[PDB]
Amino acid sequence: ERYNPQRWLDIRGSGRNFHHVPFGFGMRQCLGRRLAEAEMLLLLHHVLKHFLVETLTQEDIKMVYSFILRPGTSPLLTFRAINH
Protein backbone atom coordinates (compact mmCIF):
# COMPACT_ATOMS: atom_id res chain seq x y z
CA GLU A 1 0.00 0.00 0.00
CA ARG A 2 3.06 2.30 -0.08
CA TYR A 3 3.19 4.60 -3.12
CA ASN A 4 6.77 4.25 -4.40
CA PRO A 5 7.45 4.63 -8.13
CA GLN A 6 11.17 3.83 -7.77
CA ARG A 7 10.14 0.20 -7.17
CA TRP A 8 9.62 -0.10 -10.95
CA LEU A 9 13.24 0.81 -11.69
CA ASP A 10 14.36 -1.68 -9.07
CA ILE A 11 12.08 -4.27 -10.66
CA ARG A 12 13.68 -3.53 -13.90
CA GLY A 13 16.98 -4.35 -12.27
CA SER A 14 16.52 -7.80 -10.85
CA GLY A 15 14.79 -8.99 -14.00
CA ARG A 16 11.22 -9.98 -12.97
CA ASN A 17 8.62 -10.78 -15.62
CA PHE A 18 4.95 -9.72 -15.90
CA HIS A 19 4.76 -7.25 -13.11
CA HIS A 20 3.18 -4.38 -15.00
CA VAL A 21 0.15 -5.72 -16.77
CA PRO A 22 -2.86 -3.38 -16.66
CA PHE A 23 -3.04 -3.05 -20.43
CA GLY A 24 -2.80 -6.80 -21.02
CA PHE A 25 -0.33 -8.94 -22.92
CA GLY A 26 0.02 -10.48 -26.34
CA MET A 27 -1.63 -8.82 -29.32
CA ARG A 28 -5.03 -8.25 -27.70
CA GLN A 29 -3.05 -5.93 -25.33
CA CYS A 30 -4.71 -2.47 -25.16
CA LEU A 31 -4.61 -0.55 -28.43
CA GLY A 32 -4.76 2.79 -26.60
CA ARG A 33 -1.85 1.84 -24.35
CA ARG A 34 0.49 4.55 -25.64
CA LEU A 35 -2.20 7.16 -26.29
CA ALA A 36 -3.29 6.88 -22.65
CA GLU A 37 0.33 7.16 -21.49
CA ALA A 38 0.74 10.24 -23.71
CA GLU A 39 -2.37 12.01 -22.40
CA MET A 40 -1.47 11.23 -18.78
CA LEU A 41 2.28 11.88 -18.89
CA LEU A 42 2.24 15.36 -20.37
CA LEU A 43 -0.65 16.75 -18.34
CA LEU A 44 1.11 15.77 -15.12
CA HIS A 45 4.45 16.94 -16.48
CA HIS A 46 3.05 20.38 -17.35
CA VAL A 47 1.28 20.53 -13.97
CA LEU A 48 4.40 19.73 -11.92
CA LYS A 49 6.57 22.48 -13.42
CA HIS A 50 4.00 25.16 -12.52
CA PHE A 51 1.97 23.94 -9.52
CA LEU A 52 2.22 22.35 -6.09
CA VAL A 53 -0.51 19.77 -5.39
CA GLU A 54 -1.72 19.33 -1.82
CA THR A 55 -4.67 17.93 0.10
CA LEU A 56 -5.99 17.40 3.61
CA THR A 57 -8.11 14.37 2.68
CA GLN A 58 -5.45 11.69 2.99
CA GLU A 59 -7.82 8.91 3.97
CA ASP A 60 -7.92 6.13 1.39
CA ILE A 61 -10.38 6.45 -1.38
CA LYS A 62 -13.14 3.85 -1.55
CA MET A 63 -13.32 2.42 -5.08
CA VAL A 64 -16.41 1.06 -6.84
CA TYR A 65 -16.49 -1.66 -9.50
CA SER A 66 -18.92 -0.52 -12.19
CA PHE A 67 -17.45 -2.61 -15.06
CA ILE A 68 -14.23 -0.77 -14.58
CA LEU A 69 -12.71 -0.06 -11.20
CA ARG A 70 -13.13 3.65 -10.36
CA PRO A 71 -13.15 5.90 -7.28
CA GLY A 72 -16.43 6.68 -5.56
CA THR A 73 -14.79 9.65 -3.87
CA SER A 74 -13.19 12.53 -5.74
CA PRO A 75 -10.77 14.37 -3.43
CA LEU A 76 -10.45 18.12 -2.95
CA LEU A 77 -7.03 19.06 -4.33
CA THR A 78 -5.14 22.35 -4.09
CA PHE A 79 -3.02 23.71 -6.94
CA ARG A 80 -0.62 26.32 -5.55
CA ALA A 81 1.40 28.12 -8.19
CA ILE A 82 5.18 28.33 -7.82
CA ASN A 83 6.91 31.62 -8.66
CA HIS A 84 10.71 31.87 -8.49
Partner: protein
Protein backbone atom coordinates in the same frame (compact mmCIF):
# COMPACT_ATOMS: atom_id res chain seq x y z
CA UNK B 1 -0.77 17.36 -30.32
CA UNK B 2 -1.32 16.05 -26.79
CA UNK B 3 1.39 18.44 -25.59
CA UNK B 4 -0.74 21.34 -26.84
CA UNK B 5 -3.76 20.14 -24.85
CA UNK B 6 -1.80 19.58 -21.63
CA UNK B 7 -0.08 22.95 -22.01
CA UNK B 8 -3.43 24.67 -22.55
CA UNK B 9 -4.70 22.86 -19.45
CA UNK B 10 -1.98 24.18 -17.14
CA UNK B 11 -2.01 27.71 -18.55
CA UNK B 12 -5.80 27.69 -18.10
CA UNK B 13 -5.46 26.53 -14.50
CA UNK B 14 -2.67 29.02 -13.80
CA UNK B 15 -4.68 32.01 -15.04
CA UNK B 16 -7.45 31.28 -12.54
CA UNK B 17 -5.02 30.27 -9.79
CA UNK B 18 -3.19 33.58 -10.11
CA UNK B 19 -6.41 35.60 -9.75
CA UNK B 20 -6.83 34.34 -6.17
CA UNK B 21 -5.15 36.14 -3.31
CA UNK B 22 -3.08 33.14 -2.20
CA UNK B 23 -2.03 32.00 -5.62
CA UNK B 24 -4.01 28.80 -5.17
CA UNK B 25 -7.12 27.06 -6.45
CA UNK B 26 -8.58 24.10 -4.57
CA UNK B 27 -11.38 22.21 -6.28
CA UNK B 28 -12.72 18.87 -7.39
CA UNK B 29 -10.73 18.36 -10.59
CA UNK B 30 -12.53 15.24 -11.85
CA UNK B 31 -14.65 17.28 -14.31
CA UNK B 32 -11.71 19.25 -15.73
CA UNK B 33 -9.65 16.07 -16.16
CA UNK B 34 -12.43 14.20 -17.95
CA UNK B 35 -12.76 17.12 -20.36
CA UNK B 36 -9.00 17.06 -20.91
CA UNK B 37 -9.09 13.44 -22.07
CA UNK B 38 -12.04 14.16 -24.38
CA UNK B 39 -10.00 16.97 -25.95
CA UNK B 40 -6.66 15.17 -26.20
CA UNK B 41 -8.45 12.09 -27.54
CA UNK B 42 -10.62 13.85 -30.10
CA UNK B 43 -7.59 15.80 -31.35
CA UNK B 44 -5.22 12.84 -31.59
CA UNK B 45 -7.95 10.87 -33.36
CA UNK B 46 -9.82 13.29 -35.64
CA UNK B 47 -7.43 16.25 -35.64
CA UNK B 48 -10.29 18.41 -34.35
CA UNK B 49 -10.05 20.93 -31.51
CA UNK B 50 -13.30 20.87 -29.54
CA UNK B 51 -12.50 23.74 -27.19
CA UNK B 52 -13.50 21.94 -23.99
CA UNK B 53 -10.26 22.68 -22.09
CA UNK B 54 -10.20 26.10 -20.44
CA UNK B 55 -13.85 26.77 -21.33
CA UNK B 56 -17.13 25.48 -19.98
CA UNK B 57 -18.45 21.97 -20.67
CA UNK B 58 -20.83 21.63 -23.60
CA UNK B 59 -24.17 19.89 -23.76
CA UNK B 60 -22.70 17.19 -26.00
CA UNK B 61 -19.80 16.74 -23.57
CA UNK B 62 -21.91 16.07 -20.48
CA UNK B 63 -24.48 13.94 -22.30
CA UNK B 64 -21.63 11.80 -23.65
CA UNK B 65 -20.12 11.34 -20.18
CA UNK B 66 -23.47 10.43 -18.64
CA UNK B 67 -24.25 7.86 -21.34
CA UNK B 68 -20.90 6.24 -20.57
CA UNK B 69 -21.74 6.03 -16.87
CA UNK B 70 -25.16 4.54 -17.63
CA UNK B 71 -23.66 2.08 -20.09
CA UNK B 72 -21.15 0.73 -17.65
CA UNK B 73 -23.84 0.66 -14.94
CA UNK B 74 -26.38 -1.18 -17.09
CA UNK B 75 -23.67 -3.63 -18.23
CA UNK B 76 -23.12 -5.25 -14.83
CA UNK B 77 -26.90 -5.74 -14.62
CA UNK B 78 -26.90 -7.83 -17.84
CA UNK B 79 -23.41 -9.42 -18.02
CA UNK B 80 -24.00 -12.21 -15.50
CA UNK B 81 -27.39 -13.18 -17.01
CA UNK B 82 -27.87 -14.85 -20.39
CA UNK B 83 -30.12 -12.72 -22.57
CA UNK B 84 -32.65 -15.55 -22.23
CA UNK B 85 -33.20 -14.24 -18.68
CA UNK B 86 -32.47 -10.51 -18.91
CA UNK B 87 -34.99 -10.40 -21.76
Amino acid sequence: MVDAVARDFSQALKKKVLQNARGSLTLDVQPSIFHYTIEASNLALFGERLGLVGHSPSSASLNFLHALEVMFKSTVQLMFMPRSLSR
